[PDB]
């Protein structure tokens, strides 16, 4: 019944995984352990209080070597040292952000987790999964997999619906994105010259791999999409601004309706929509991968089309980590 | 030699027109009077200290009901009563944002002014101008003209180099925009449901008529463009994100090269470029109508294009308001 997980790296997403599990009321995932090299006390405190997501819904105590909500806490620099065999770990959730590589993440297999799921694109991933779109391809042949990114998780279901309805010849994606943890509050030394500037002071153009990735989850679209991002001064919630050329002449109503159909049918709980005049903060804490904004569909001359699609880049994705982990457990 | 102007509405744009003249040290324009809703002293203080632009780069003395840096100051909310005739005002600069309409704006000529320049699209305008693109179309047969908008002024030059080079089949523009003073700090009653929302708290989609206005000033693109805006938590500096189908199979290098040329040659001082990895605040107080970001140009299969174009929605426009005022004054 219950799939035994361990969270490696108790950072935003790791904590958000936990919170998604408790909030949703789901009973199919047991969080057996967490690993992180900072204080156990500090970890519980960050779980308790979040500036974006509010108070933990429940009580949070540190008792001995565990956090009671009863989750064992570990501190290993080297994931291969974790007692995953002893703890009968089904799926290790790699969340630290520094072991995204398949080479690197396979350390949890060494430690005795039966499978690994990386909360980010993974280099040499056995499979990159956008739950609700391609998780059905998961099988005994896959041991270390990627959950894609928040952005990929948003763009793909929408891509799919559009391609099925009007066909996408080519498309360009700009994601207007909230600042993330790898950005600094003030200008400072960095791997990337864009992301080195004060995060809450500018619109910052930056790179995203999501459009290429949608080329893989949906092989019909390989090489037909590219994409970039613009980071702006909001702490959470992002949006895909997609312009594409359609293979057949179409309308706003045509596109909106295929979205409503998909959202009400086979992508229920992955894709949603709004006919209301909403702004980014209204999607904060929404669990969908994508929420399509009907108001914003525009179509020039029946063939050049633009859509706008919100996503809580933390909350959507963390709920997807749960679904992917459960679907993945069934192939063990 | 000099052009006599009166500024109606010493608001963000009213005051920045005045700073623009002072900073450039242009002697071709003389501010004779200004009108605003409130104090003589408050207008002085606001001019002195600007949260976005910094110290007013001279001295501002209150003296009588006049400001010395000598300009006379009024406070009649009704424009019809102000005495432009006996002040010999060549061109009036309607800058309030509430007499945008031509039928309304034509008051300044009743109240004596020889010509009128609305800082903002207008309804029944004799001619809508983007300086550096279409100003040589101004004739004696024009009394009340429109300076267009910040966004119109930045798309139009770029559309021109693009079209005239590679041809625009169809185009969709998103502007990512700094908040403006028609938005509030907190959610509150507004004629528009998006713009009612707390302005530094969300990305906020909104309508702009700039794409359409570009189709009228560049007649060749009548109804070939559409656009929207997303307001984000920055206080100044916006950007154009343009996706379009090009008539000719093209490249990035080719796109940026054409922009180099327009920048150095015929659009010098209106259009500039950058090859550097810059972010929005690096373009604060830049006087250009458009600054092209090379790095950011993308082309899919040689046909679907994307460019990114910065603009100081306050400083660029306010300088054009000066250049327009001058070119207009010559048809008198
Ligand atoms: N948050 C989002 O918006 C989002 C969306 C999609 C994908 N992702 C992906 O998820 C991953 C994590 O993102 P995040 O926002 O949670 O960042 P985060 O920095 O808040 O999380 C990283 C956590 O791992 C811990 N850590 C670092 N090194 C460690 C080590 N050697 N051993 C154990 N723990 C270690 C840190 O203490 C921290 O708690 C990233 O790779 C990112 O690509 C994030
Ligand atoms: N600021 C920008 O980014 C930008 C860009 C392009 C165009 N514009 C246009 O410039 C115009 C002015 O906008 P702004 O940025 O100055 O905003 P603002 O509200 O700061 O300026 C308007 C000023 O006029 C005054 N005013 C209001 N009603 C008046 C009345 N009845 N009589 C006399 N004075 C009155 C107000 O006190 C205020 O100071 C707008 O129409 C806007 O569309 C602005």
TrEMBL record, chains A, B:
Which residues does the record give as NAD(+) binding sites? 12-13, 36, 77, 119, 313
Q: What is its EC number?
A: 1.2.1.-
Q: Does the keyword Cell cycle apply?
A: no
Under the heading Pfam families, the entry gives:
Gp_dh_C (PF02800), Gp_dh_N (PF00044)
- KW Cell membrane (keyword) present: no
Q: Where are the transmembrane segments?
A: none
List the GO molecular function terms.
NAD binding; NADP binding; oxidoreductase activity, acting on the aldehyde or oxo group of donors, NAD or NADP as acceptor
Q: Which GO terms describe its biological process?
A: glucose metabolic process
Q: Which InterPro entries match?
A: GlycerAld/Erythrose_P_DH, GlycerAld_3-P_DH_AS, GlycerAld_3-P_DH_cat, GlycerAld_3-P_DH_NAD(P)-bd, Glyceraldehyde-3-P_DH_1, NAD(P)-bd_dom_sf
**Gene3D superfamilies, alphabetically?**
Dihydrodipicolinate Reductase, domain 2, NAD(P)-binding Rossmann-like Domain
- Alphabetic keyword roster: Nucleotide-binding, Oxidoreductase
Family, as annotated? Belongs to the glyceraldehyde-3-phosphate dehydrogenase family.
- NCBIfam families attached to this UniProt entry: GAPDH-I (TIGR01534)
Q: How does it assemble?
A: Homotetramer.
What is the name of this protein? Glyceraldehyde-3-phosphate dehydrogenase
The record lists the organism as: Bartonella henselae (Rochalimaea henselae)
């Amino acid at each position: 019944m219950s799939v035994r997980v361990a969270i490696n790296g108790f950072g935003r997403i790791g904590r958000n995984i936990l919170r998604a599990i408790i909030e949703s009321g789901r009973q199919d995932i047991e969080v057996v352990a967490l690993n992180d090299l900072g204080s156990v006390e500090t970890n519980a405190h960050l779980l308790r209080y979040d500036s974006v997501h509010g108070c933990f819904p429940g009580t949070v105590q540190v008792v001995g070597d565990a956090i009671d909500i009863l989750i064992k806490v570990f501190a290993e620099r080297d994931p291969a040292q974790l007692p995953w065999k002893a703890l009968d770990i089904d799926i290790a959730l790699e969340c630290t952000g520094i072991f995204t590589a398949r080479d690197k993440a396979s350390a949890h297999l060494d430690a005795g987790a039966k499978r690994v799921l990386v909360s980010a694109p993974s280099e040499g991933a056995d499979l990159t999964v956008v739950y609700g779109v391609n998780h059905q391809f998961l099988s005994k042949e896959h041991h270390v997999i990627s959950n894609a990114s928040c952005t990929t998780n948003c763009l793909a279901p929408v891509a799919q619906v559009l391609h099925n309805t009007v066909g996408i010849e080519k498309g360009f994606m700009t994601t207007i994105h909230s600042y993330t943890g790898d950005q600094p509050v003030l200008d400072t030394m960095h791997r990337d010259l864009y992301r080195a500037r004060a995060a809450a002071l500018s619109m910052i153009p930056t790179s995203t791999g999501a459009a290429k990735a949608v080329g893989l989850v949906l092989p019909e679209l390989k090489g037909l999409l590219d994409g970039v991002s613009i980071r702006v001064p909001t702490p959470n919630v992002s949006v895909v601004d997609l312009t594409f050329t359609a293979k057949r002449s179409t309308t706003i109503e045509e596109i909106n309706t295929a979205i409503r159909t998909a959202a009400q049918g086979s992508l229920k709980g992955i894709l949603d929509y709004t006919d209301e005049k909403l702004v980014s903060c209204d999607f904060n804490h929404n669990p969908h991968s994508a929420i399509f904004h009907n108001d914003q569909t525009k179509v020039i001359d029946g063939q050049l089309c633009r859509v706008l699609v919100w996503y809580d880049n933390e909350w959507g994705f963390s709920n997807r980590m749960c679904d992917t982990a459960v679907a993945f457990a069934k192939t063990i």
